[PDB]
Amino acid sequence: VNCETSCVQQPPCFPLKIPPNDPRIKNQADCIPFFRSCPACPGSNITIRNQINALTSFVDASMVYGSEEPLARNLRNMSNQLGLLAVNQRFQDNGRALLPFDNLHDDPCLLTNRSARIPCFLAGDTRSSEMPELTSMHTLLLREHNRLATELKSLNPRWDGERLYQEARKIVGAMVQIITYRDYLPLVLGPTAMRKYLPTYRSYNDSVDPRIANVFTNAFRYGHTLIQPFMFRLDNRYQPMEPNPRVPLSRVFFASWRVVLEGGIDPILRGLMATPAKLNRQNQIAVDEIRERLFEQVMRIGLDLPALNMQRSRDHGLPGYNAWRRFCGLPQPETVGQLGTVLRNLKLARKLMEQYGTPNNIDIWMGGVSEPLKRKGRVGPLLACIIGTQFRKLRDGDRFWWENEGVFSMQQRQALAQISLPRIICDNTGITTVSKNNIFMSNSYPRDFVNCSTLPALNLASWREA
Amino acid sequence: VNCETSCVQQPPCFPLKIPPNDPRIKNQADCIPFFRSCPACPGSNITIRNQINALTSFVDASMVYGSEEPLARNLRNMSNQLGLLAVNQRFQDNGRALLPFDNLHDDPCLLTNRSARIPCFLAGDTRSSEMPELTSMHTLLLREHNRLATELKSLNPRWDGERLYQEARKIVGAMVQIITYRDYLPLVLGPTAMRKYLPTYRSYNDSVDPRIANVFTNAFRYGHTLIQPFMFRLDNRYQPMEPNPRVPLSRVFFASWRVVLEGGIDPILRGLMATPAKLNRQNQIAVDEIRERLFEQVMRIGLDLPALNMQRSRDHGLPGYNAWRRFCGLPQPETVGQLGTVLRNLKLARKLMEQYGTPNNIDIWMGGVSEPLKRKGRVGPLLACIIGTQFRKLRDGDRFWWENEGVFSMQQRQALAQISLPRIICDNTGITTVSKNNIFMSNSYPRDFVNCSTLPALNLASWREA
Amino acid sequence: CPEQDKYRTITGMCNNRRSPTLGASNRAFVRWLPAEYEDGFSLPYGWTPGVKRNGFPVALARAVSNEIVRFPTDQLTPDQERSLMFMQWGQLLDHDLDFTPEPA
C-alpha cells in the first residue's frame, strides 16, 4: 500500500488533517503524507508497542565508521597495507579528498537537476547528503582522519595496518569527545545549571544505565527554532562573492551538485564562521520558510515542520506537560492565572488556554519551547534539566572514557589537553581566519578574526614506539 | 518431548543434574523433572526475555471470585433469584456447607486414594487442593460471604439480587483488607520498619505504579522456611484425636478425601489454633520432611524445595546478592572476614565460601535467609527493605481503598473499624473457645482462651436504604 | 469506560484513569534492575558446560542444598510466640497476590 498516493486510514498509514480557511491548501480534501514508526513486537496482543534504536549510544564517532559489520567492511581500503579510508575516483575538488559515491534503487539526488546527473553521497548514516554543511563537515573529518593515519604510519615503520587503523580511530574518537563536551556544553545550560547538574569526574561506575529514552529524542529538538532562511558565501578576502551570493533555503534541499560542480566546499565554511544566528522570542517562535516550502521539489505538496513534530509526539505516546513538570520537582499550575504567572506572559497563556481545554494536555515540545529562557543560556528550566540528566547518564557509564585510568598515560594526557577546532580548520584546508576562544561566540569581522600563525600545534612524539 | 518421562535437554525442557555421592540417589544417570517459564514474546531475537502474570495485583479478595469473566459466570449461582455462590450436592459437613466439585481431564486427585473415588474441588485458583487447611480457609470465607449476603438481603426488601451480591463482595474485600493489614503487618517486620517505611495514610495518589515487581516473588518464598513435619487434630475438649492424633506429612498432599470423609474442617481449625510454629536458626533452616519425600505418591521420584527455588531464581535471571545489598543502601562485603563479621559466624562464612567462590555469585534466596534475625521480627534488613517498599507502593495506588473519601461514610467507617479475625469462627463453626486479642500471637493453653459469648458483633442498620 | 462508576470490575480496567491498563492482569512484570543472561537475551547460566560466570565455575543447586541446608530432624526447636495461623495466612495472601503460568 502506497501512502504517498493514497489517503486510506489503514495501518501503517496515519494521515494528517487540515482546518477550514487554510492559507496554503484551499482544498479541505487533501492529505499530508505520514507513516507510523516501526514497532518492536510485531503482532503481540499482550505487551506495549515500543520503538527500536539503530546506532550506538556512546559518543564514539559512529557517524563516520558505522555500526554494522558489512557497512564498515565496505568502507575501508583492503588493497593496501596502509589501511587508509576509501575516497572518490572520478571527481576531485582541487583539494586532497572527497566522499565516495553511492548507488540506490531510488535516488532523490537525480531529480534536483536533470542535466547534472550527480548522484547522492554515502557515509555512516543515510542522511548525509540532505543538508550540504553536514556533507562538508563529514568531508573535513575524513580528511583529518587520513592525515592523522598518514603521520602515525610515518612515525613508526614496523607497525601493521590494523594497528594504525585502530589507533587513528581511537585518537579521533577521544578528540571529538573532548572538543564537543568542553565547547558545546558551557554555552547551552548555563553556569548554575552545570554547577548543579554536572559535578567533577571521579572514576568509572558500572552500576549506571547508559541507554537512551524517547523523551530525550523528542526534547533535544529545540534547535529547529533557530532557522536562518538563506545561504550565504564569501571569497578569499571577506566579501560577498558573485555570482549567486545569497540563495533561498527552499531550492537547496537534496542538492549535492552545488558541492561538486561549483564552489569547492571552502566558501560554505567561510560563510559558516562569520554569520550570526537567530534569537528566540515569545512572538518569533519559528521561521516561516520551514513551515511553507519544505521539500517542495521532491514531493507534490510542501510539508510543515512543527505540525509533523507534534504528530510524531502524539504518535509516540508521551505524557502531558504537567506530568513532566511534576517529574522535575517544579510547581504545577492549574488555572489560567497560574499559567500566566509561570509563563511570565499574558497573551501567550491566553492563546494556549483558548486552543485547549486544560494545561494538562499541553504537548511537550510547545510547552518546553514557549517558556522564557534562562540568563546566559538558550533553554528553559525543563529542557535544560532533561538534557543535563541524559548527558550525565551517558557520560559516567562508558568504559573507554578518555579520562579513565588505564587508557592513556600522563604524558599523553598532558599533551592532549590543547586540541581546538580552529587548528583543525586551519590545518585541514586553506582557511586562514579563525576565532580565538569560542567559535560559537566570536561572530564579527575584523575585530574577531586573526591568522592561525599565532597558534599552537599538536605533537605526537609521545606516541612514538621504540 | 514429555519431560514427565524423559531427561533429554531439549527446549522447552531443563532437567536438574545430580552431584556424585548423593545420600538418597546413587546412580548418576537419573534426572529431576523441571519446566521453564512461558516467554512473553515467542520467537523474538530483539527484546529481552520477560514473564507473564495472571492475577490482579490489588488486595481485593481475588482468590474467591476469580479473575476472569467466564470463571466468575461459572462460579455464580443463577438458578434462583437471591444472589448466591455454588455448593456441592453429594456431601455435607454436618449440614453447614461445602465447596462445589470440578471436572478435569487428568486429575492428580483421584490417584492418591483409588478406593475413595473423590474428585477435586473448584475455587478461584488452581492451587487450592495442596493441603486441607487451604480448603478450610476457602470454605470459611465462602460461608462468611454467604451469611453476609443473606443478612443484607434480609434487611432491605426492595433491593434486587445483583446489588446484594456486589455489596457483599465489597464488604468482604474491605474486611479482608483491614484484617490483613492491621493484624499481620506489625508482627513480621518490627516497630522500626513500620516507623521508617510505612507512615500514616494521608491521601490518594494517581502517579504511583501499582504493578507487582519481578523480584518480590522470590522474597516471599521465605515463608517456606517454617513448616512443621506433622499434622494434629483435637476434639471439643482439648485432647488429641483417637485414632490418628499425629499424621505425618508426605501423605496428605492432594488429599481431598480427608476433608470429605474424615469429619470435616472443624478439628483441622482446632488443631491450627493451638500449635506452635518453628523458629529459624543459622544451623537449622529447612525441615527434612518437605525436602526428601515431596509429592512422592503422585510422581515417580520426590523433589526438594530449596533446589527448585534456586533453579527458578537462576532461570529468571535476577542479579547477585551484593547488587541487592547495594540497592537498599548497605555496605558491600568483599573478603571472608568482612562477610563473617556481617553474619556474625566465621564457620558459616567459610562454608559459603568453599562452594560459592565469591560473595557476588550468592543467590538472592540463600543470602536473604541466612541473614541474622531482627529484634521482635522474623526477617533480616534486606528482606524488610524489599517487602516494605512493595507493600507501601501497593497501598498508595488503589482508588477503592476503604479509607478514601467518597467510598464509605463516617458512621459506616466507625462501625467497620471493629472487625477482628475471631468472632468469625464462632459465628460460622461450632467452636466456642478462641484466643483473646491476637490470633497470631497467643498459643499457650488454657492461658489465652475465653468463651464465645464474650465477643462483639457488627450491625448493618446504616446500610438500610429507605 | 464511562465517566461515572461505583463498583469494581472483574478484569480490573480503569483503575488508573491516566493509563487504564496498568496491572489489570495478563501483563508482564516490572524490572527494578536490568536482567542478566549468559547469552545476553535468551540463555540462562549453567546451560552450556564449561562456561564460567564472572570468572568462576558455577555451582550445582543440589550440592549447595546438600551442604548447608541439611540438618538433623530430631533437634527441632519450637518458637514460643507464634502459631500456624501465621504461615497459613501468609500462604493465603501469596495465593491472593500473584501467579505464574507454565506450558503443558
Added chain:
Amino acid sequence: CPEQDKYRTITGMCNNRRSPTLGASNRAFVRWLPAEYEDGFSLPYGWTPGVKRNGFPVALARAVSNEIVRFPTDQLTPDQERSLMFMQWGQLLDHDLDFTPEPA
C-alpha cells in the same frame, strides 16, 4: 565476551561486563514514565473520531501550527552573541546519538 580487550568493538557489544546487551544496536528504547494510548496498548489518540482526552476534545496539529507558530518574517532579530556553528554541531551530535527506523 573475552576476558581481555584493548579496542572498541564495531557494534558496542560487551562494553558492560555484567550485561553485554546494554548499549548495543538494534535494541529497544527505555521508558521513564508509563505510556498512554487510546485503548491501552496500541491505538493512538485521534484515530477514532468523536473521542475525548481527559474529558476534552483534542485539537488538530495543523490548526495549532497555523494559529501559534505563524509570525511575519520582516521583523527578524539577529542574535549578537552566538554564531551559526550551533546548527552544524547540533546536527552532528543528534545524528550520532540516535536514529529511528521507519517502514518503507
